């Protein structure tokens, strides 16, 4: 569920960091800028992998800081379509089962992709599932969040920006399915 993404970038190296070798400073400044942020079309950048080509360090007029163009690769949480993950449950909602995946928070399960013998709550928060012989209608998705196993079937990019005149929705929403046989909580199979 992790990929390499070859990216190019201009890294402004400030001039108090000239005593230090440039490769360590490029890595430090790129980790200070890409970590824990969602790039619009590739996903969530975890950390830098390596620097693969490091061009010449220009000095622009009006600033003493040396800019350089860096060819690098970065690990990115971007799970491809139809992929199985395991993660904790944060909480239940009328819109569905909000699934945390450790670091990443917005994995939503719609009601249309829950397991079919029960799809509805009795005006209670926690979502339920009914089997006839044991645990009829009292099985539940606990808010303490035992680990479930789901299957991502949709991902969506919104370009979260201040719309309107200037100078909170998630930019990386991920929608999965659980309805296949064998999925759900790990306690059920």
């Amino acid at each position: 569920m992790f990929v390499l993404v070859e990216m190019v970038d201009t890294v402004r190296i400030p001039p108090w960091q000239f005593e230090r070798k440039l490769n360590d400073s490029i890595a430090e400044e790129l980790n200070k800028k890409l970590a824990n942020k969602v790039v619009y079309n590739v996903g969530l950048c975890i950390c830098l992998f390596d620097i693969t080509k490091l061009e010449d360090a220009y000095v622009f007029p009006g600033d003493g800081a040396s800019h350089t163009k860096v060819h690098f690769r970065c690990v990115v949480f971007h799970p491809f379509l139809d992929e199985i993950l395991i993660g904790k449950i944060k909480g239940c909602s009328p819109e569905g089962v909000h699934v945390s995946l450790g670091f990443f928070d917005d994995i939503l399960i719609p009601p249309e992709s829950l397991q079919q013998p029960a799809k509805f709550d009795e005006a209670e928060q926690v979502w339920v599932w009914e089997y006839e012989t044991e645990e009829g209608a009292h099985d539940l998705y606990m808010d303490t969040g035992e680990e479930i196993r789901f299957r991502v079937v949709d991902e969506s990019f919104v370009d979260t920006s201040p719309t309107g005149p200037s100078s909170k929705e998630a930019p990386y929403t991920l929608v999965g399915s659980i309805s296949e046989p064998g999925l759900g909580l790990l306690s059920w199979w």
Binding site: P14, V59, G64
Partner: protein, 78 residues
């Protein structure tokens, strides 16, 4: 080989002293042992006289080809 002139022109001298004095005005490491000089342009000129400025001049010929000259290997003059 490099075909351009080996003398540092007055424009190259002006901008190398400018960019170096701007970097010394921020917290860059000074390459020469300064002696209580405060104005960073004087420190840049003392670096230029002793040939220690870490700048490479890239001279662009107008077709697109370029030439890299170190500041320590130009022939500076008055």
């Amino acid at each position: 080989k490099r075909i351009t002139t080996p003398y540092m022109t007055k424009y190259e001298r002006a901008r190398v002293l400018g960019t170096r004095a701007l970097q010394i005005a921020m917290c860059a490491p000074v390459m020469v042992e300064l002696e209580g000089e405060t104005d960073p342009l004087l420190i840049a000129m003392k670096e230029l006289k002793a040939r220690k400025i870490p700048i490479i001049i890239r001279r662009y010929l107008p077709d697109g080809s370029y030439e890299d000259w170190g500041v320590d290997e130009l022939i500076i003059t008055d």
